[PDB]
mmCIF file of C-alpha atoms in Angstrom:
data_model
loop_
_atom_site.group_PDB
_atom_site.id
_atom_site.type_symbol
_atom_site.label_atom_id
_atom_site.label_comp_id
_atom_site.label_asym_id
_atom_site.label_seq_id
_atom_site.Cartn_x
_atom_site.Cartn_y
_atom_site.Cartn_z
ATOM 1 C CA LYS M 1 91.014 95.151 92.815
ATOM 2 C CA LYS M 2 93.939 93.071 94.822
ATOM 3 C CA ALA M 3 96.079 94.305 97.466
ATOM 4 C CA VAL M 4 98.011 92.168 99.268
ATOM 5 C CA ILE M 5 100.012 92.423 102.545
ATOM 6 C CA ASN M 6 102.712 89.449 104.388
ATOM 7 C CA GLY M 7 102.294 90.369 107.648
ATOM 8 C CA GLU M 8 105.273 88.105 108.826
ATOM 9 C CA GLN M 9 107.986 91.120 106.121
ATOM 10 C CA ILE M 10 106.075 93.927 108.259
ATOM 11 C CA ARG M 11 108.662 95.447 110.806
ATOM 12 C CA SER M 12 106.060 98.435 111.255
ATOM 13 C CA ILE M 13 103.567 100.651 110.884
ATOM 14 C CA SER M 14 105.070 102.544 108.463
ATOM 15 C CA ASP M 15 105.838 99.779 106.747
ATOM 16 C CA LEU M 16 102.021 98.480 106.208
ATOM 17 C CA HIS M 17 101.812 101.606 104.638
ATOM 18 C CA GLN M 18 104.521 101.697 102.465
ATOM 19 C CA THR M 19 103.306 98.252 100.951
ATOM 20 C CA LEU M 20 99.824 99.487 101.160
ATOM 21 C CA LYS M 21 100.755 102.753 98.801
ATOM 22 C CA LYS M 22 102.823 100.083 96.005
ATOM 23 C CA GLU M 23 99.763 96.893 96.927
ATOM 24 C CA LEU M 24 97.010 99.637 96.484
ATOM 25 C CA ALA M 25 99.037 102.317 93.934
ATOM 26 C CA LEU M 26 98.454 104.756 96.358
ATOM 27 C CA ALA M 27 98.805 108.352 95.381
ATOM 28 C CA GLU M 28 102.952 109.286 94.992
ATOM 29 C CA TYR M 29 102.460 111.467 98.171
ATOM 30 C CA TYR M 30 100.565 109.700 100.348
ATOM 31 C CA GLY M 31 100.261 110.838 103.870
ATOM 32 C CA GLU M 32 101.226 106.721 105.702
ATOM 33 C CA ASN M 33 98.569 107.867 108.311
ATOM 34 C CA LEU M 34 95.567 106.650 109.106
ATOM 35 C CA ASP M 35 93.732 109.303 108.735
ATOM 36 C CA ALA M 36 95.173 109.815 105.078
ATOM 37 C CA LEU M 37 94.333 105.562 104.577
ATOM 38 C CA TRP M 38 90.804 107.537 105.558
ATOM 39 C CA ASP M 39 91.297 110.175 102.508
ATOM 40 C CA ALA M 40 92.336 107.373 99.694
ATOM 41 C CA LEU M 41 89.829 105.079 100.475
ATOM 42 C CA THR M 42 86.897 107.893 99.884
ATOM 43 C CA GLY M 43 88.258 109.309 97.231
ATOM 44 C CA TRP M 44 91.513 106.847 94.908
ATOM 45 C CA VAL M 45 90.346 104.412 95.759
ATOM 46 C CA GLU M 46 89.147 102.107 93.314
ATOM 47 C CA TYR M 47 86.515 99.703 93.817
ATOM 48 C CA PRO M 48 85.519 96.856 94.301
ATOM 49 C CA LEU M 49 88.352 96.283 97.163
ATOM 50 C CA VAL M 50 90.045 92.707 97.923
ATOM 51 C CA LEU M 51 93.176 93.060 100.432
ATOM 52 C CA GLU M 52 93.996 89.888 101.590
ATOM 53 C CA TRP M 53 96.159 89.678 105.147
ATOM 54 C CA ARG M 54 98.418 86.557 105.807
ATOM 55 C CA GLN M 55 100.204 86.504 108.786
ATOM 56 C CA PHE M 56 97.759 88.521 110.818
ATOM 57 C CA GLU M 57 98.471 88.008 113.480
ATOM 58 C CA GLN M 58 102.380 88.210 113.106
ATOM 59 C CA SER M 59 102.305 91.855 112.019
ATOM 60 C CA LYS M 60 100.176 92.338 114.742
ATOM 61 C CA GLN M 61 102.868 92.123 117.194
ATOM 62 C CA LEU M 62 105.856 93.046 115.422
ATOM 63 C CA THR M 63 103.466 96.331 114.932
ATOM 64 C CA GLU M 64 102.609 96.596 118.360
ATOM 65 C CA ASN M 65 99.203 96.110 117.250
ATOM 66 C CA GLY M 66 98.834 99.030 115.287
ATOM 67 C CA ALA M 67 98.106 96.815 112.063
ATOM 68 C CA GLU M 68 94.612 97.164 114.398
ATOM 69 C CA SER M 69 94.072 100.405 113.785
ATOM 70 C CA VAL M 70 95.790 99.831 109.606
ATOM 71 C CA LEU M 71 92.149 97.119 109.750
ATOM 72 C CA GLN M 72 89.960 100.021 111.527
ATOM 73 C CA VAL M 73 89.722 101.690 108.873
ATOM 74 C CA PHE M 74 89.275 99.189 106.089
ATOM 75 C CA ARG M 75 86.313 98.027 108.028
ATOM 76 C CA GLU M 76 85.228 101.662 108.554
ATOM 77 C CA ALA M 77 85.319 102.066 105.163
ATOM 78 C CA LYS M 78 83.036 98.699 104.984
ATOM 79 C CA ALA M 79 80.766 100.043 107.607
ATOM 80 C CA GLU M 80 79.470 103.267 105.687
ATOM 81 C CA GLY M 81 79.732 100.950 102.300
ATOM 82 C CA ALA M 82 82.889 100.227 101.348
ATOM 83 C CA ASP M 83 83.351 97.552 98.289
ATOM 84 C CA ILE M 84 85.896 95.657 100.385
ATOM 85 C CA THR M 85 86.148 91.896 101.135
ATOM 86 C CA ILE M 86 89.580 91.467 103.416
ATOM 87 C CA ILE M 87 90.753 88.204 103.953
ATOM 88 C CA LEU M 88 92.680 88.345 107.328
ATOM 89 C CA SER M 89 94.663 84.668 106.838
#
């Protein structure tokens, strides 16, 4: 229902995936890559979903903009109709 990312604590793309793994209660063998993220959104996660992403710009610098691609996956599921709310602090 509610997943939180403290971007200040992010140090890489995998950190993001593993945080997401914990915050969204993803599958034990979740793949930690952009494709696994799409698959978990379409066939694992329960909606309504609120994803609060704090200090987004900081996580952006610390992942060589990788956070932007992870964010695109959520926006894509949203464009396709998924009930997701993203809060970018």
